Amino acid sequence: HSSGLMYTVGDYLLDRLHELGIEEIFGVPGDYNLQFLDQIISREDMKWIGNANELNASYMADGYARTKKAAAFLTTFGVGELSAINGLAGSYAENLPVVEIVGSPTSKVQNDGKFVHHTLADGDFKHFMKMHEPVTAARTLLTAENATYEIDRVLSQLLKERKPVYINLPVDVAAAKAEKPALSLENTTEQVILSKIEESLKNAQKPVVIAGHEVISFGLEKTVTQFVSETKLPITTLNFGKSAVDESLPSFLGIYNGKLSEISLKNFVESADFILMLGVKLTDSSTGAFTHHLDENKMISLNIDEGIIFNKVVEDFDFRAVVSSLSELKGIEYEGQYIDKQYEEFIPSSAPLSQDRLWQAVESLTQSNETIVAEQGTSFFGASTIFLKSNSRFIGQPLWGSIGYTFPAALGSQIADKESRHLLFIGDGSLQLTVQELGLSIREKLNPICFIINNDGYTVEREIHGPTQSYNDIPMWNYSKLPETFGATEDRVVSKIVRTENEFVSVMKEAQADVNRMYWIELVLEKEDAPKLLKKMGKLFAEQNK
Amino acid sequence: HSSGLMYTVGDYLLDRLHELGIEEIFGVPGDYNLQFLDQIISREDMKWIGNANELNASYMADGYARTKKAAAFLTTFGVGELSAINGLAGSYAENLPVVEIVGSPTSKVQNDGKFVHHTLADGDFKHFMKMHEPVTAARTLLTAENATYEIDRVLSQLLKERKPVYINLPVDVAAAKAEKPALSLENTTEQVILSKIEESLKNAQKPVVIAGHEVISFGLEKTVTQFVSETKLPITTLNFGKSAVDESLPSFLGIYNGKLSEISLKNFVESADFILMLGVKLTDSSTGAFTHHLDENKMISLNIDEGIIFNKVVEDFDFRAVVSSLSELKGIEYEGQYIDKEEFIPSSAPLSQDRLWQAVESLTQSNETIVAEQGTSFFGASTIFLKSNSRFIGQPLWGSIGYTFPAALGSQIADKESRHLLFIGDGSLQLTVQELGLSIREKLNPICFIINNDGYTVEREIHGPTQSYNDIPMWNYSKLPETFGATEDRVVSKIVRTENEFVSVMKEAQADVNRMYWIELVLEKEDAPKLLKKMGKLFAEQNK
Ligand SMILES: Cc1ncc(Cc2c([C@@H](C)O)sc(CCOP(=O)(O)OP(=O)(O)O)c2C)c(N)n1
Ligand SMILES: Cc1ncc(Cc2c([C@@H](C)O)sc(CCOP(=O)(O)OP(=O)(O)O)c2C)c(N)n1
Ligand SMILES: [Mg+2]
Ligand SMILES: [Mg+2]
């Protein structure tokens, strides 16, 4: 004790999760995990945060992982795990270190082949783990004797690749005896790679660094930011991995998005004489539908699973080790120009809110040490191009792109860093998929600023195909009234409806000033209104489907 | 004159769905399915009914299947289909004929291995179909050259087994040319089975029939009901397959649930000299945690996959064909007795669980469908005797909480003339509440009871009665319809606390066929119906 005044498999698992930095476990209870849940409740160093449903729990764990750099959630066998699998798939796609724990029937029930609840009544308890093979880096069915090695094996794989892993935990196994961990869980080609990077950077007249999502996966943002700060090297990111570096760096150019990039940024990146890509994946939504021009002949790219050194593929290196050794490089100093930074100002009028003006206002009014979370739809595509301030971050999911993700994800991220004020931008259509975590937000007394874009349906989809087709319409809820209906009082959540630019600035300032309450702001915009980038990207998506 | 002087693969699929009797398609749009969606919207013979999310869409299609006897839903590649997979798993477990259509990127995009949205950015577009293998009877990724063959193959498997099937439909493939279908979709072993059943029923002095969920799967309820009515044979069902026969039959004994059965029913079933089981599976929640006593030496059981004739296994038979030939058997008439069959008088007393289900039993009418969610609702409602032409939807094998709300709406869409009564707990409603918008848009008139007992009471009864994980955030449930956009001409919302209030509101609801009823029932967290008090401890022992 600080004052100076049987261990089980369940304790071992929880101790290892604590080592990973996890202080909160998400999910939904079931009879097959209640005894292990008791162990979670008893922990002084970690909190159970129960969700309304398992898909939302998986999304929430993903957001938490993006900020905390590790996460865990708990489901019940069959019905819980299968409800969550789309969230885990997203975590695999965008490479987030999430542990799913699945409580399963006792070893004896499984071995007896009993037709119990949450099964297909065929006595086979292994179908569901098999179904997770494509979306997990490692998976295990624990036994009393295998538990400590199996837990360590799969969590070591989480540390190695920062992809999700899967632990099936039978009821009786969690209660079985174990002993405390003895040790914690935590170069030639690597040194060659560093020498070639050093040589290339020093010889380059116009170098450019491109940082991506795998930097975020490994929590290497501060490391890359420091490297770029010290060397003054020009840097850009895709919208996939936005905030992989601090956007207040003087050498940060903006977001490269193929032919949809700002012209001066596009010209700079595409005329660079050397390109260093760190943890980047080029996807449709992050390259203006594959209209990027990045010359492999002038490039060294480093990813988790491979590196390409001027066209030579290498696999025998550690991505984290190489990136962390970049500030052993001395004497690299860019002496050229960057591009002109446009002046950021927003002067409101009484005009009704429009998309392009909305994002101009958000850019101006967002502060340092805030996290912007933006949903697929007008929100992602508008917010993607805003210049973030010092120590500010971004969460978007452009590869997996599961609408509804951002609401639970914003809440998980907000729990992960209570000192970083989260601003959520989510569409009306997207909120309807995951709205039930509003209850959790109230119970946990979270204080994010949530903006719900009521544009009477799926505007991003209207921009791609069938602008006046009925399938792009949704039932209109009274969005501003949701907190009250879900049990919130005025001293917990402040709810608003905003129609004009003047109203938006007033509420935004009011919300930003009041750090001790959650804000729930219904923004009314026209269904035909889309931000400039989305008007362009919509037609590219449409072309891709022809 | 005086002088003497196109059809596509998408259309083909929709024509086949029409053939299956499907008039509504559920789901959620995505760019990879919008052009196929245009084809659905254009149809005169079926309607797109868009859901809030895909899990709910799969649940809704399942409920629709239970009543309509076939169903379809549409998702987008990756994110849509994986969101729905728990619903499809439940349809596989409980054997419902649901078709999932997944809209996927163009064949060119797939062949080029492009890193497009809703993928793992590895160029592989086959992972998600593989993930469906254990929960589908058949699956296909359509090409322009195999599309009609493959549609017919998988829909024929749906007809054969009545389990869910899966069709991945690339954008360009749906728009590819096709020709209208040339053919419609559709032994001694069966004769021996029928003869052995006939002989056993002829010679039996105390036969009993047990009907199960696979009867519901094949739409054989009326067939089995007719057979039992003609022969006067004693019949029971498990709670898994409740309403596989009409419960108003004179020879309907009640629900057999192992040692938790009513004593006279248990004694009757377990002393029968011959047992005929039709489409039954014995599961923990449907046998009082495996405390049933059914002697295979006295039994002929028929299932979709397998038949057992006095311990001898048979497989070369058509389950539907055999069940459909039972009314042709002769010299079968039961001449014995059954088992012996209180007026419900309400008071101002606060609502309690056992009294609630007594009231429901007394007030339920003919031509209703009762839907009951895992929790106090299922365990209470499962023993109510249904009136004539009334049905039940419960999911005791798969047991996914939240299922019943979308399922109840889907079933209600499937049969507009059966008034649906839903009993769902507060904890369960919180998983699937967003389909309230759909119910309002579609002007559905079910009667919905939400059991507000301040958390997960069934779980409290199993383990940790005062542990914080059994608590949930309390919503103002009665206010949900209003907040989701309902007006008073569409939904009537109320909070009910007493027995008098309950009888009044249920009667009021049943009398008003033109509006939806949304009724919050207030009960204590410690209160559970008698069956659940027992089952809670049996689950606890099962997890030792
Ligand atoms: C789980 C799921 N289902 C379906 C989709 C398809 C889809 C998107 C594809 C393109 O990813 S964008 C979109 C509409 C989002 O509408 P909104 O939230 O109202 O946003 P806004 O009106 O501001 O554009 C859908 C349904 C998806 N991405 N994820
Ligand atoms: C999708 C999902 N998640 C979790 C469970 C576990 C579970 C049940 C296991 C046993 O199936 S029963 C139950 C509580 C239901 O609570 P309620 O709806 O408030 O019902 P009541 O309070 O009336 O008992 C849960 C969470 C489940 N069945 N399905
Ligand atoms: Mg919208
Ligand atoms: Mg409850």
The gap between the terminal CA atoms of chain B, to the nearest Å, is: 91
Q: State whether residue B396 sits within 8 Å of chain A by CB.
A: yes
Sheet containing B235-237, strands listed edge to edge, beginning at the edge strand earlier in sequence: B252-255, B235-237, B207-211, B274-278, B299-302, B307-309, B312-314
Q: Which of B453, B421, B436, B467 is nearest to B532 (CA)?
A: B453
Q: Is A417 exposed, middle or buried (0-12, 13-18, 19+ CB in 10 A)?
A: middle
Task: Report the amino acid identity of residue B308.
Answer: I
Eight-class DSSP state of A470: G
A303 annotated to bind ligand: no
B326 domain residue, yes or no = yes
CA distance B462 to B260: 16
Instruction: Give B106's DSSP letter.
Output: -
The token pair at A267 is 């010209």
B86 φψ region: left (φ > 0), alpha (ψ -120 to 50), beta (else): alpha
Pairwise CA distance, residues B424 & B449, whole Å? 6
Q: How far apart, in whole angstroms, are the C-alpha atoms of residue B283 and residue B274? A: 21
Distance CA A433, CA A12 (A): 36
The distance of B402 to chain A (nearest Cα, Å) reads 9
One domain for residues A430 and A324: no
Query: Which ligand 2 atom sits nearest the alpha carbon of residue B431?
Result: 1
Query: Is A546 part of a structural domain of the chain?
Result: no
Asked if residue B544 belongs to a domain, the reply is no
Determine the atom of ligand 1 nearest the C-alpha atom of A427. Answer: 18
The angle that helices A34-42 and A9-19 make with each other, rounded to 10 degrees, is 50
Nearest CA to ligand 1 atom 16: A458
Residue pair A210/A256 in contact (Cβ under 8 Å)? The answer is yes
SS (H, E, C) A299-364: EEEECCCCEEECCEEECCCCHHHHHHCHHHCCCCCCCCCCCCCCCCCCCCCCCECCHHHHHHHHHH
The radius of gyration of chain A's CA atoms, rounded to the nearest angstrom, is 24
Burial class (CB in 10 A: 0-12, 13-18, 19+), A357: middle
Token pair recorded at residue B60:
């809704």
Locate B493 and state its tokens. Answer: 């919302």
Check whether residue A171 and residue A291 sit in a common domain. no
**B430 Cα–ligand 2 center, Å:** 11
Domain ends where: B306, B321, B347? Answer: B347
Closest by alpha carbon to B298, among B261, B325, B271? Answer: B271
A149 and A200 housed in the same domain: no
User: Nearest Cβ partner of B41 from A90, A92, A471?
Assistant: A471
Chain-centroid distance of CA B66 in Å reads 5
Q: Are residues A294 and A367 in the same domain?
A: no
Indicate which CATH number applies to the domain containing B266: 3.40.50.1220
Question: Which residues fall within 8 angstroms of residue B534, CB to CB, at 6 or more apart?
Answer: B260, B288
Are B147 and B251 contained in the same domain?
no
The DSSP string of A260-305 is TS-HHHHHHHHH-SEEEEES----GGGTTTT-----GGGEEEE-SS
Contact criterion met (CB < 8 Å) for A85 and B82: yes
Q: Residue B142's domain spans which residues?
A: 1-186
Residues B179, B280, single domain; the answer is: no
Q: What is the dihedral of CA A443, A444, A445, A449, to 10 degrees?
A: -110
Whole-number Å distance between alpha carbons of B246 and A382: 58
Q: Judge whether A342 lies within some domain.
A: yes
Per-window interface: A 324-363 vs B, CB < 8 A: none
Q: Do B473 and A487 touch (CB under 8 A)?
A: yes
Of A501, A251, A253, the closest CA to residue A362 belongs to: A501
Phi, psi angles (nearest 5°) of residue B116? -95, 165
Q: Are residues B326 and B244 in the same domain?
A: yes
Q: Looking at the structure, do residues B13 and B146 belong to the same domain, yes or no?
A: yes
CB A285, CB B117: distance < 8 Å: yes
**Residue A490: CATH number of its domain:** 3.40.50.970
d(CA B187, CA B283): 32
Q: Is residue A141 part of a domain?
A: yes
**Domains identified in chain B, total number:** 3
Residue A545: inside a domain: no
Q: How far apart are CA B42 and CA B8, in angstroms?
A: 13
Asked whether the beta carbons of A76 and A405 are under 8 A apart, the reply is no
Q: Is the CB of A223 under 6 A from ligand 2?
A: no
- Does A66 fall in a domain? yes
For residues B179 and B195, is the Cβ–Cβ distance under 8 A? no
Query: Which of B37, B139, B284, B495 best tests the A interface by mutation, with the highest count of A CBs <10 A?
Result: B284
Angstrom distance (rounded) from CA B399 to CA B462: 15
* Full DSSP string of B452-498: ESSS-HHHHHHS-TT-GGG------GGGHHHHTT--TTTEEEEEE-B
B457 lines ligand 2 (CB under 6 A): yes
Q: CB distance B469–A436 less than 8 Å? A: no
Residue with tokens 């058997």: B329
Residue indicated by tokens 């429901």: B360
Torsion of CA B201, B202, B205, B211, to 10 degrees: 10
Rounded CA separation B301/B287 (Å):
16
DSSP β-bridge partners for residue B370: B392, B421
Nearest-Å Rg of the Cα atoms of chain B is: 25
Look at residues A320, A349, A378 and tell me which one is the last residue of a structural domain.
A349
Which helix (H) or strand (E) segment is B181 a member of? Answer: none
- Given A114, A115, A471, which is nearest B50 (Cβ)? A471
Residue A284: half-sphere exposure toward Cβ, Cα within 13 Å: 26
B124–chain A nearest CA distance, Å: 10
- Cα–Cα distance between A404 and A192 in angstroms, integer? 44
Q: Where are the beta strands (DSSP E) in A114-217?
A: 138-141, 165-170, 207-211
Structure tokens at B420: 């649906």
Distance in angstroms (rounded) separating the CA atoms of residues A467 and A472 = 7
DSSP secondary structure string for all residues of A86-137: HHHHHHHHTT--EEEEEEE--HHHHHHT---TTS-SSS---HHHHHTGGG-S
Contacts B397 to A, Cβ<8 Å:
115, 117, 119, 121
CA distance A377 to A538: 10
**The pairing of beta strand A421-427 with beta strand B491-496:** unpaired
Is the distance from the beta carbon of residue A151 to the nearest atom of ligand 1 less than 6 Å? no
Instruction: Compute the distance between CA of residue B189 and CA of residue B176 in angstroms, rounded to an integer.
Output: 44
Residues whose CB falls within 8 Å of the CB of residue B195, separated by 6 or more in sequence, listed in order: none
**Is residue A228 a contact partner of residue A245, using CB atoms and an 8 Å limit?**
yes
Continuous segment of H or E residues that includes residue B418: none
One domain for residues B103 and B25: yes
Is the residue at B127 inside a domain?
yes
Q: How far A69 CA lies from chain B's nearest CA (Å)?
A: 20
Looking at the structure, tell me whether residues A342 and A357 fall in a common domain.
Answer: no
- What is the Cα–Cα distance from A193 to A215, expressed in whole angstroms? 17
- Widest distance between CA atoms in chain B: 96
Q: Taking phi first (over 0 means left), then psi (-120 to 50 degrees means alpha), and beta for anything else, what does residue B529 get?
A: beta
Q: Tell which residue, A378, A374, A402, has the closest CA to residue A388.
A: A374
Q: Which residue, chain included where needed, has tokens 């009960």?
A: B523
**SS3 category, A15:** helix
DSSP string, A17-65: HHHTT--EEEE---GGGHHHHHHHHH-SS-EEEE-SSHHHHHHHHHHHH
Q: State how far the Cα of B124 lies from the Cα of B114, in Å rounded to an integer.
A: 9
Cα A72 from Cα A63, distance rounded (Å): 11
Q: Which residues contact B93 (CB under 8 A, 6 or more apart)?
A: A119, A120, A121, B397, B398
Q: B422 with B526, same domain?
A: yes
Of B170, B186, B202, the domain-final residue? B186
Instruction: Based on the fold, state whether residues B4 and B36 are members of the same structural domain.
Output: yes
